[PDB]
Each structure stands twice: as structure tokens, then as C-alpha cells.
Amino acid sequence: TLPKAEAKELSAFVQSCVEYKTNVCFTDVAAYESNQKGVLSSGLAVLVGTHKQLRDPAVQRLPFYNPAVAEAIERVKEGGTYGVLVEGLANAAGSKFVRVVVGEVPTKASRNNCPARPDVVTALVTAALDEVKEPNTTVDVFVLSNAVLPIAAAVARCGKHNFSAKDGAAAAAYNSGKVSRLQVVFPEPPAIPPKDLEAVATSTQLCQRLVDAPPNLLTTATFTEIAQGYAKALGFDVDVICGDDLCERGYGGIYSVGKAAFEAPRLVTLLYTPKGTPVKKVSLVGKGIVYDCGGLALKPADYMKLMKHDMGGAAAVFCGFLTAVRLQQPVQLSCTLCLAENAIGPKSYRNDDIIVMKSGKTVEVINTDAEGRIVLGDGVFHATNELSFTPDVVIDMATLTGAQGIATGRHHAGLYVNEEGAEAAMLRAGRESGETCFPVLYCPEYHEPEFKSNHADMTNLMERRDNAGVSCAGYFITTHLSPKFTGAHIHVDLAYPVFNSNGATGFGPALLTEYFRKL
Amino acid sequence: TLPKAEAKELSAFVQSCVEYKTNVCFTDVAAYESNQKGVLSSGLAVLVGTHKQLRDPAVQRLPFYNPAVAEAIERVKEGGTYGVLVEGLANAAGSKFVRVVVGEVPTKASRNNCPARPDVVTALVTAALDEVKEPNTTVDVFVLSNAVLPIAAAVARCGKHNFSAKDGAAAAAYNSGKVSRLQVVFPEPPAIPPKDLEAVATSTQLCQRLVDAPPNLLTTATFTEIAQGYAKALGFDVDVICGDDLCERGYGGIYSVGKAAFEAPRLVTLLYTPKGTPVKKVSLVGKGIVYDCGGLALKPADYMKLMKHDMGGAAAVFCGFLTAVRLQQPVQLSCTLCLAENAIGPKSYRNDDIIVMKSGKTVEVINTDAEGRIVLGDGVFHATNELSFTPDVVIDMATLTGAQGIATGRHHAGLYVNEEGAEAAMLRAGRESGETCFPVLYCPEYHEPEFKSNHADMTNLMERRDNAGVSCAGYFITTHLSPKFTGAHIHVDLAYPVFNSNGATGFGPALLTEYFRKL
Amino acid sequence: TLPKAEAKELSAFVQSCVEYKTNVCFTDVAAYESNQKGVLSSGLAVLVGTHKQLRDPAVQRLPFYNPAVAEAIERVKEGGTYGVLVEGLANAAGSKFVRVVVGEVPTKASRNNCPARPDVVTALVTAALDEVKEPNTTVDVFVLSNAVLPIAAAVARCGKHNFSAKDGAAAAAYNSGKVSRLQVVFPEPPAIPPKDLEAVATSTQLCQRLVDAPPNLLTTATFTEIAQGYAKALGFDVDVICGDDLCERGYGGIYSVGKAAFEAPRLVTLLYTPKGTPVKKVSLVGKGIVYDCGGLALKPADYMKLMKHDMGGAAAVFCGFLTAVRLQQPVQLSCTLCLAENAIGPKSYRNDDIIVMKSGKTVEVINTDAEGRIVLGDGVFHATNELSFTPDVVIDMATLTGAQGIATGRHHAGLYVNEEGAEAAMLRAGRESGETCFPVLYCPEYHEPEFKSNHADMTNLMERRDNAGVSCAGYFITTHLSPKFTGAHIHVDLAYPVFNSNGATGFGPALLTEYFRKL
Amino acid sequence: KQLRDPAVQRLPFYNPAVAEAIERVKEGGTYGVLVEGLANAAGSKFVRVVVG
Ligand SMILES: CC(C)C[C@H](NC(=O)[C@@H](O)[C@H](N)Cc1ccccc1)C(=O)O
Ligand SMILES: CC(C)C[C@H](NC(=O)[C@@H](O)[C@H](N)Cc1ccccc1)C(=O)O
Numbered sequence A, B, C: 001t002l003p004k005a006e007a008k009e010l011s012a013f014v015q016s017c018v019e020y021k022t023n024v025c026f027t028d029v030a031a032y033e034s035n036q037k038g039v040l041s042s043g044l045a046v047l048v049g050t051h052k053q054l055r056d057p058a059v060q061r062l063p064f065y066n067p068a069v070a071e072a073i074e075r076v077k078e079g080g081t082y083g084v085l086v087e088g089l090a091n092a093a094g095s096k097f098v099r100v101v102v103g104e105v106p107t108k109a110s111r112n113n114c115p116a117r118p119d120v121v122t123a124l125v126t127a128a129l130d131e132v133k134e135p136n137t138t139v140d141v142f143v144l145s146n147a148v149l150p151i152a153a154a155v156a157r158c159g160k161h162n163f164s165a166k167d168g169a170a171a172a173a174y175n176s177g178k179v180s181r182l183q184v185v186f187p188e189p190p191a192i193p194p195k196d197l198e199a200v201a202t203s204t205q206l207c208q209r210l211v212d213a214p215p216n217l218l219t220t221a222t223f224t225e226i227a228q229g230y231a232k233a234l235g236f237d238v239d240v241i242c243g244d245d246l247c248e249r250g251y252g253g254i255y256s257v258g259k260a261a262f263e264a265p266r267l268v269t270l271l272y273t274p275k276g277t278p279v280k281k282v283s284l285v286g287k288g289i290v291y292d293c294g295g296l297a298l299k300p301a302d303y304m305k306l307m308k309h310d311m312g313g314a315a316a317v318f319c320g321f322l323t324a325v326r327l328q329q330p331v332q333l334s335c336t337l338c339l340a341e342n343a344i345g346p347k348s349y350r351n352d353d354i355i356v357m358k359s360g361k362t363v364e365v366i367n368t369d370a371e372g373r374i375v376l377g378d379g380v381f382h383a384t385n386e387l388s389f390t391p392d393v394v395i396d397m398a399t400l401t402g403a404q405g406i407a408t409g410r411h412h413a414g415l416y417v418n419e420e421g422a423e424a425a426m427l428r429a430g431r432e433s434g435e436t437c438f439p440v441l442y443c444p445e446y447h448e449p450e451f452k453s454n455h456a457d458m459t460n461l462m463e464r465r466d467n468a469g470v471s472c473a474g475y476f477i478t479t480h481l482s483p484k485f486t487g488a489h490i491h492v493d494l495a496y497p498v499f500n501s502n503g504a505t506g507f508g509p510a511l512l513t514e515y516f517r518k519l
Numbered sequence D: 001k002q003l004r005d006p007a008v009q010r011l012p013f014y015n016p017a018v019a020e021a022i023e024r025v026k027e028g029g030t031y032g033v034l035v036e037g038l039a040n041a042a043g044s045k046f047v048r049v050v051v052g
């Protein structure tokens, strides 16, 4: 039992997440001219585009353009911003001056990147929004790219985060009071409708909120409640297997990992079936480790910090699922959240313990800090064996390995995929969405020997850690796929892309949305 | 909750502390000649003074003096002892020989030290008492200094400790059977009355007892009981905020730090108002971490050893408060004990958790092993906001940082102080009392940026640990002072001065007594 | 200067490498029947193939086949061996019994692997050769695969190594006396002529020898002498820039890395131009760190062990070059060996030193143990700027990062490549040759910021080591490409594939040979 | 306070944009504004004025 004040805070936080609405809206230049008649929304305007786009004659026709802005365009550095005052520009806030911040997007983009470079878009707008003078204002963000989806997600993830505990925000269910309403103004009417773009942005930001949230607010229980709240509101199915019932029902992996914690582990499965025939049946599985202390294999404090992000895969699949429901995408979806806190205490699963996985395979625990793969093993078996359908594609997303950062870096999620076709499709989705990925070695014949055990079917940790660590963690997960499943399996290791130095990025949902789109 | 045998042991230990009486008494040479008529109290006598004092003609008139003693004076090394037998010296134990141990105190003393060098006095008497032949005897300690307060504390802290578990003492409520009664014989009638000196010595030793006591005996609960016992006996007020009530009442800092532990955290506030108009209103706040395991940021065993001393600041303020009550010093006092065990388990506050402090400010926990500043933050806000008066001066005392030892060393507590005047006054009190201090950098404009947080008002740990660490910990505490408070704030970091290789020193109470004296 | 006995030993070792001849020959079943008329070469015969190949009717017609061998085929485990005695089988050693060892090769092979699974072929033959009874024998190795190139290299790298210091071999210029002559018997006449296969095998084993050799034998000087010896013998060009001349000629990278060592660094460039028009101009550049102690950034002993392998990239390109010359492949080649010992002493380049690279770019040395990329920077600039031709393709090979093992593992060299076409071609070559590769992230826009320096053009080490470390090391190298070069650059990180628990693998040369074949 | 001294108005680069920079600049921060047609030795169309 929790103190009443803490329970009240948790309920309010749940509600803040269930009712989360985005601060971003979308329009185009002609519609803007028509609706606002040259009156800026506030005393700040942002203009972002490539060196060339910024010099297009059409830019001169923008309502804030003048010779100072032209000079800003000359003086701005690639990847940088440059601000100029414009006197007596009509604006809804009534200010003698409007500040116009120009940002230059690079055109350089490697074959593994998104050509629109939404990464820099995000950074530019973030920087520009630091010039906001007052709160509760609307900032016009004029973008010269028509790459609407990656730009939508880029702007959604930019600026001050909706999650905040600063300056009394704790009393307002941790809804930030520092966020500006953002009006993205594309050159042309967007190929994807504005309300659809809002739904994408909303999911990016909800994902960000969940990840940013500390574990004292986002627990196994509150995450479950949030999912249940969305289920009631949007009318999808929710199945919860909780605490000791996991043990009784043979879910030894997730049970063992989570059982030491104050809040019980949960296997939460969400179902969405579209009207009419689905283009595909897809099962999503997310690593929902609300906090990873390491268990008995305790992390040092510097590594343990930011392990509140260890549910980033669960948040990603959860929010991608929400977007699919909200936009009524024609994909049949399961979304299985593998919720646990990897805690330390008398009930800790041990370095030596042998787990009976839901798959029936036994796992010797070499290291309790390799918890994610165990939890996901139960998740994928559940998805591929225990649902009312058998999926064509299984996608698991997880903040799984430090190796991932070493291998594919801070901006590219690592892909371990059993089929070239699915892999290429996810890579395409990454390049289109901006939520970029890169493959890691798929070679089960070389991963399999690393998990030999004297007494169990397998260990949970490689004998040699310098033998394709991102890949091996993926391999472990595959051993727990049901034999009934013969489809494509996409393992997404997103340990690093889910955050940056400002906090969560909301990486993952837009990737999924784009992937679903092209199925 | 506890086994019956353990509960009985705890009660007995509480009683041993509540009823603690000192082994030291004080007199002077003429009163001694008058009451004992040249008959030594036992077969051991100690003579301590400087090279010059030892050669004063008055020394020849001491009842034990003879040519052997004169020779001891020639042979003794500075900072050392030298013992000689004297045959047929009248003594109350009827010993054929009396052992006379001479000890030479240095005169060398830097401007940051106590000129009477009580540090050496303590060491000399400690060494001399090792020559005690039988226990339960009274040893005459003839001191040639008239620096009565520092000598009183020095002798109080010397020799075998009143806390012991050796040789069956556990059955006697851990009251040592190895302690000698000590009769300090000053040259002149002491400027401070003997019974007043006893009260000081008593507080030094009670402080020593509490600090020495292992955490299986001195818990959050037993410390609270001890305070309550003294409150009934001496007639002062006691307020206790316990366990989950700390959470309900907004004391998020001390609640979060303490909640993992077996015994609940407590905020214990004691009040003393003198009969007259007080010279000053002073609020004392003490770090009462009964044991600091580090929490989830677990300490290695070699660092974790001696973290039973982590309540040294609470003991210091508690015992300083007792002395003020017993001697009826004309200071109005609050004494707030911030009691918690920093424990590891499922309920552990986390590296990532965000705390809502009593001050209303939010704290992002970077490292759970920086618990003291958090607990103190709630303590100082309580003192400056929640009491029936507003203090002129806030003094917090805490075994706060390893940096303290690096900066100011084993014998000098570090002072972080917002006013030059209060700082100088505490320094002077340290020099007079022998419980020496030294300032650390006060520069809030440079400390403040170290605690920047993405999501909370502040972190609990510096981004850079090599940027005035003693000072930064102090700074943190100041951020939680009430806006209602506009007085002097003295932060005392006494991590190292509270112990030496023999255990607790009882450092702190005498410092406070002397400070109160000169207000 | 060296002791005379050490100089004699080095000369002999040089000669052993320059004159190295392989122990492997190649034939086919019909030619074997014709030349040996059913008489086995010795008392051991090896039969290796897939489960299915082993059950082909043709197997029954092999000269050693009998019912015991049929049983061995039933009893052998996948990836294992099984031996049976056959009495009175004609053999050249006149052995009462012939031991026939059957080995089963798996057919399982992922899309990133060589379908013939030469990895297992090597392991099987290695195991089987442990049954050799006497030395200086010829062992018939009957292979059921017709994948002649990968099998040739697989057998070349198997069994006991030609480098040895056991049992007096030091007195025989470290030529092992434990090696068996091996006669590989393919089912059909090999698509590649036997003498051409011998040249491939010879290069695999020479590469192995150089890598296995400890740095007291294989020094910057002896490696250079070996290259000169081959140049005299085969009639290709050799250019040597030695020691202080590197500094005088602006080769600040390789000079600074190597200058602390007892033996001077050398930039050794070899040239081969075929008769007639080359299909391509290719420049090879190899990391020839004869020993990597870490420099002032000293490695711990457990990591420093096996840094004699740190010239594995130089050995690879060197031997790939030799094969091209010996087989007269129609490729114009340069081969640049970046030879240095990364030593520790008074002349050590420092953590802080600023290097003026041959490229004209300055490099701030953050860490002296990131030496390889520096040495290679000078190598690739040399190749792309200082030769009599400009290459179409630059291939650098290096044992460059620990990240490589983490990312792509022990069997797959990491590829960082500026063009998709070249990457795909090298990957194809890896799958055909058996010397498998896998790509790492190519994304210069994300690597570049990691190398920002306050005072130099760049650092030699990433600010963040968890941001695509294999890729970032590659990126560094690319910054030193001449602007004159506009072709394909293939960076091969082969830190782990160059060795296994038995020592060097001779990985690299066959990869190159196969790549050159398909140009 | 120094930035709001009347003497500041008499500086050769001062104009209403600069005055606005003084309002908008954050403590410990900078804020830059363009001033068109201010005489300068480099003959620059605009002079950038950075207030701190
Ligand atoms: C110690 C090892 C057995 C396993 C360890 N991984 C973990 O503990 C995972 O549960 C982590 N949740 C993976 C991770 C690492 C760094 C940043 C973000 C995420 C790892 O090193 O990757
Ligand atoms: C790990 C850091 C965040 C903070 C740490 N301090 C602590 O844990 C405090 O709670 C300790 N109670 C301070 C301490 C250290 C050494 C000897 C006596 C007392 C310190 O290093 O000073």
C-alpha cells in the first residue's frame, strides 16, 4: 500500500497521459494567408530550410520577409540559427517587433539517412524556441521542405518537453507550462492530412512523456492503467496478466525478472482489428522495463541513471499502436507490453537461477542485468503462440544493449531480422520517417554457440561478449518464438535513439506508422 | 515486527543512553589538597602540560612529585608520555607503588588551531590510561593548563569508550566495564563551574556513544526514543513526524531517502525556550543517517564500513541542545533531527526519481548516495518555515561529503556560511572549544549551475564533482531555506572530525556550546 | 644495434617468410585414381562433406570406403568428426591400419554467410589431423564440395600452424616440424587450377605466419625486409620511407606513432602493374602495427596480449598483393604497409600532442592507443596523392577497433564504405571466399562532430565512444583522403577475424583475391 | 542597470532595435540585432550589434 498523497499523484499522472493532446498543428502557406491574412500568430516566427530552399523566390512572398530576413539568410551558418527583428509586422500578440529566426538545414545526407535531415530541423526549431518571450503563445514555424511526415515528428520532438516537474508543474500532473503552441506551415497542402499529422505528433510526444517520466510516476501499474485508459477511450481490447498469475501461467521469464519489485510485473496485450480485411497481421512486443537497476547484478550509479528510459521500446510500440487505432490503419495488431521493474531485494532472481520460460525452454541466468531479452522471450512466445491469430510479422522493440550504441550509434536503431525483405522495408520506413535504423549481423549459426549451458537449454548471456552483442541478444529472443510462427521477425534495438541530452526523443512510433503504411 | 530478544536489547540500549552519566569530574589543586589530603585516588596519576608548564615551581608542590617524576619530565618527548614508579605514596587503592605518567603537550599551534592543543591532551591521557592495572578505579589527571572548556571536552573524549560490546558488555546494555573514573585537577578553580564542565563532558560522551553505536542498536526508532526520554526528563518539547506521514505532509526528501528501510524515517524537532528574553533564536538541523549503504547507488564495503557514523551531525546538534537545556543557556533553540536509514531494496528511491521537497522545489535524483543534502533540505525548510518562530541563525551539521576530508582534513570541520560574521564567530568557537573548523568556498553563483536539471528544478548532484564539492553540497541545502528566513546560515560538514581510528570523537556539541556562549 | 645472435635469428626468420612454401596441394578424384591407383598417401584419410553429400552413391567408389566408413557416416554428428580403422588398405606409409576420419559439414548458412560453411571445414580437418601418428606424412583430404576457393583457404588455415617455437623449432627459423602435407581431393577437376589454388593457400599461410609471429621476430624492419625479398624474387617495385625521413617528408602521423620504438617506423609501398590494360586501379593500405602497447595510453596486460596481431591488416594486403602478382591478375595495384610499433618511452607521442598529417590536416591526440587510424590516415593520403597513378578504389585493412567485435563479431570483418556498389561487391567476395564481412553504418554527417577539437582540425578519438565506434574510426581515415581521389573507399575493420583461439587465421588475402577476380 | 543608463543612448550604434535587444537579452546571455546603414570601416550594409 502507498501513501494517499503518492496514490493521488499517480492517478493525476495517469490522467495526464491518457488525455495528452499535442501542442503542434499543421497548415500550408496559402491556407495560412487565407486564414490569418498576413497577421503573425505571435512575436516570434521561425523559418527553416536548406541553403537553396531559403533562396527560392517564393520565400520573398512570405508575410514576414524583408531585407533584414534576407540578411539573416546570408549570415546564418549551416546547422545554425540567426535571428532578426522586424518592426511593425502585424501580429496577434501586438508587439512593436517580431523576431524572425532563420535556420539552415544541411543537404548532405548519406544513403543510411533521411534526405530531409529532420534531425537538424528538430535542433534548429529547439534553438529558435529559446527566443520565446512569453508563454501560452503560438509560434509560426515555416518549413521549406514538403517531407511532411519526418518534419511532423521532428517538430513534435523539438523544444521544451511536455513532461516537466519544474516551477510547480508537479501540482499540475507534470504538464509543462513552458511549452509553446507550434503552427507548422508547409509550402504546399500536406500530402498527409493535418489531423493525421497531429495524431503522429501526439504519439511522438506521448512516447516522449512516458520515457521522460521518472519511475516513481511511470510504474508497471501506471503504465498498465494508461493503456487501459486508452482502451476505454478508443475501444480496443486489453488483456493483463499480472504478478503471481505470470508464474501460475508459465511466464517464468517476465515473472522472475519482475518479482523482486514493489509493483508487480505485467504482461499487457492490446488488440486492434480494423474494419474489413487487414493488409497484414502484425504482433508488436515492447521491452517495458520501467527501471533497470541491474537486479543482483547491480549497475553502478552512472550507468543506472537514465534507466527510466528502459521502457522506451514499450512506449514506442504502445504509441505506434495508438496511432494505428486513431488513423484506422488497415493492419491487424497485437501490442504486448512486457512490464517489469528489474529490482534488487530478497526476492531477486539470481545469477545462477534457472528459469522455465513460457516457451518451455529453460534459461540459466548468468547475469540478471540481461533482463530484457528474458522478458521479451516471454513476450514473443505469447504473441506467436497464445493469441487468437498467428501474426505474419513480429516486431519487438527494446532498449536492449549498450553494444547497440557502439555498433550503430545514437541515431540509428539496430535491426536484427530473419528475412531480407522485412529488413529492407523497415530500413525504408526509417529513412522516410526520419527514425532511422541500420542492420546488425544476422547469423544464428554463429550466435547460438555463445549461449551453451551446462544444465539449462541456454544461458541468458554470451560466453564471449565481443562476438556481435546486438545480434546475440536478438538471437536469444528468437529461440522463444513459437514453432507455429513462420513469418518475419524484426528485432529493433533502440537503446540510444530513444534519448538525447535533452531527454526522450519519442523515437519509434513514427517508424512503425510509416512501416505499416507501406505494408 | 522484531524478535522479542532484539526488542528487549533495543529498550535496554535506549535506557543506557537516556540515563548516560559521565565518568569525568573536575576540581583544582587546592580543593584536591583540602579534600584528599595528599592521598591519591588510585595507583595511577597523570600529569599533562607543556614543556614550560611542567618546569613551573608549582609542579614540585604536587602530592606525587619526587625526583623520579622530575626525571620523567626531562626524559619525556614532545607529544609523548613517560612513566615512573613512586614507592610508598599514599593512595586510596593501597598500592605499594603509584605509577606517575607524565605527558608533554606541544606549544606549537597554527592560527587555525586551539592554542591549548587539546588534541594532544586527549592522546596523552589515552596513552596514560593504558597503564591502568585494575578497572573501576579513579585516576587523577593533573592538567597544567587553565583552558578549562577545551580540556574538559578533550578528557571526555579520551581513553576507552563508554560504548562497548566486549567481554559480556552486550548483557549490560553495552555500557563498557573498561572505563576509568577520571578526576581532572586544574591548577586554579575553573572559570566554568565543575558541574557545568561535567554537563559538557557528558554531552561529548553521549554524542560519542550514539556515533559509536552500530545501526542494529541505534536506529531511526531508538534515536527518536532517546530524544523522547530526554524530553520527559528535562522538560523540553518534542515533535515527531514519522514514516508515511512524512509523505502525506509533503516531506518528500526525507521520506524518499528513508522509505526503503526496515525502520521508518522520522523528522524529530525539539524545542527549548529559556526563561528570559533570549539573546538569539537558533535552529539546529542534523543529518541523522543511522546507516548510509548508498541506497541503489550502493557503496563498496570498504567505504560502507563506518557509515554508522553518518548520524554524527544529528548526535552533535542533539547533544549541543542537551547541554544548552542542562546549563540553561539563554538561547532559544529548535533542534531538528533528520532521521533515516539509506537502505537498499524494492522501495528504494532511485537514480532517476524526482522528489517533491517540502520546500516545493523538485529534485532529480542523480545519485542516491547523495542522500544527506536531500534529508537536510527538508530539515532546514522545516526549521525556517514550519516552527512557531523564525530563527535568526540556522546551523546544520552533517557528515556530508568525502570532499570535506580532502579539503579541510580530519580535524577541521568545513564551514559553508552565507555571512562573514557568523562564519568568524563559529571559527572562534572552534578555536576556543578545540572542536576546530575551517571555511570552504562560499560562491553560490558558481555552485548553482552544477545542479541544472532537464526536468526538475534541480539535481542532487553536481555535473562536475571537481568544482568545490563541500561548497556545492552546502549550496544545495540553501536552495531549500524558506523565503521567510533572512538570517545567517552556517553549514557544518563534519564527515571526518566525528571519528578517528579509535571510533567516535564526540565532535560538535562543545563547539555549539561555545558558539552559544558568545552570541 | 642488436646482439649478433638476435640479428642472426631475425635474418633466418626473414628468410623463412620470403621462401615460405605451402604444405597443401590440390587434385581431384579421377586424377587421384589415375596417379595413385587406390594407394592412400598415408595411414590417415579424411572425408568431409554435408549430410547429403556423404550419402551420395559416388562416395562408395572412394578407395577407402567400406562398411565401417559407412557406419562412421551414420554415427558422425553435424559439425563433428568420427574415426574408423580400415585393415589392409593399401597406403604409401605401409600402415597395418588406415584411420578414416569422417566430418559432417552443416548446410545451415544465413544470408550473411558462405553457403559452403568453410568455417566448419577448417574445424573438422583440424580435429581430424590431431589423429596423425607420425610426422612428414601426406594426408589425403577428400572433400565433397566443389566450392574450390573457400575450401582451399579453409584447408590452408587448418591444423597446426607453420609458425612454431615448440621443441627446438626456434633453431629451424620457427618452421614447424608438426605440420602434415595435405592433399585436397575435390570431386571434379577444380574450376580454378591446382597451382592457382596453391598460390592462394600459400598466401593464407604466409599471412598466418606473419600474424602469429611474435614482435621480437616480426618487427618493422623484418616485415620490410620480407617485402623487399618478395620484390626481388617476383620482380615488383618497392618504395620505403623510413624513420626520421617520415618526419622530414611530412608523414607526421606514422612518424609520431612509431618514433618511440626501438625499430623505426616505415611506410612501405609496393607496385604491381599487369601486362596490358588493367580492369581497375586499386590501392591497398594496411595497418602494420607490429605491436600495440597503447603508447602512453598504456593497455592493461590482458588487452595487450595478442597485440602482435595488430599487423593483421598489413599482412592481409601484403599477401593479397602477392597472390595478385603470382597469378598475374589483371589489376593494377599499390600496396602500402603502414609499419610501426606503438611503443612507450621518452620519445612517445603524447595524449595532447598535435600532429601535422601528410594530408596537411592537424590531429590532436586525445588517446595514443587510437594509433591505427592515424597511421592509416598517412597511408591513404600517400596512396591517393603521392603515387604515379590515382586509384579507382582504395581498400584499407586494419585490426582497428574493439568495437568491431562487439558490432560484427569474430567471423565478420566490418565494412565502412562510401559507395553501395563497392560495399556489395566486397560482401559478395566475402561470401564466395568464406572470409566473410558485414557492413557498419556509413553516416559521415553523424561521425564528423565526434572529432571536434579546440586547437587542431580534428581529434583522433570520439568525444562519445558509444556512437558507432567502428564507423567513426573509418570516418577519421576518410578525412585524410586526397581531394584528387573521387573513387570508392572500402575500410575493412578485421580486428577479430584475423585470429581465433589457435592463433592467426590468415583472414584477408583470399577475400581480396576474390574481390579482384570479379572486378 | 548600466545598459539602461541614459549615456548608452548617446553611443554611435544605438537605435530602437538596440533598445529592444536590451529588453530581450537574458542575464548572462547575449542578443544580437542588425542596424542598417550605420557607418563602418568595413563598408558593411548592416552592422550587427550584440548586447550582453
Ligand atoms: C551487463 C550486460 C549483461 C547487459 C547490459 N544491458 C542491460 O542491462 C540492459 O538491460 C540495458 N537496459 C541496455 C542499455 C545499456 C545502455 C544504455 C541504454 C540501455 C549491457 O551491457 O548491454
Ligand atoms: C557518492 C557521492 C554522490 C556522495 C558521497 N557522499 C555520501 O554518500 C554521503 O552520504 C556520506 N555520508 C559522506 C561521507 C564520506 C566518507 C566518509 C564519511 C562520510 C561522496 O562521495 O562524498
Ligand SMILES: CC(C)C[C@H](NC(=O)[C@@H](O)[C@H](N)Cc1ccccc1)C(=O)O
Pocket: C292, C294, C310, C367, C369, C370, C371, C372, C399, C400, C401, C402, C403, C461, C495, C496
Ligand atoms: C582505447 C581506444 C581508444 C581504442 C582501442 N583500439 C586500439 O588500441 C587499437 O589500436 C587496437 N589495435 C584494436 C583492437 C582491440 C581489441 C582486439 C583487437 C584489436 C579500442 O578499444 O578499440
Ligand SMILES: [Mn+2]
Pocket: A289, A292, A310, A369, A371, A372, A399, A400
Ligand atoms: Mn535493461
Ligand SMILES: [Mn+2]
Pocket: A292, A294, A342, A368, A369, A370, A371, A372
Ligand atoms: Mn539490464
Ligand SMILES: [Mn+2]
Pocket: B289, B292, B310, B369, B371, B372, B399, B400
Ligand atoms: Mn551519508
Ligand SMILES: [Mn+2]
Pocket: B292, B294, B342, B368, B369, B370, B371, B372
Ligand atoms: Mn551517502
Ligand SMILES: [Mn+2]
Pocket: C289, C292, C310, C369, C371, C372, C399, C400
Ligand atoms: Mn592497434
Ligand SMILES: [Mn+2]
Pocket: C292, C294, C368, C369, C370, C371, C372
Ligand atoms: Mn591501439
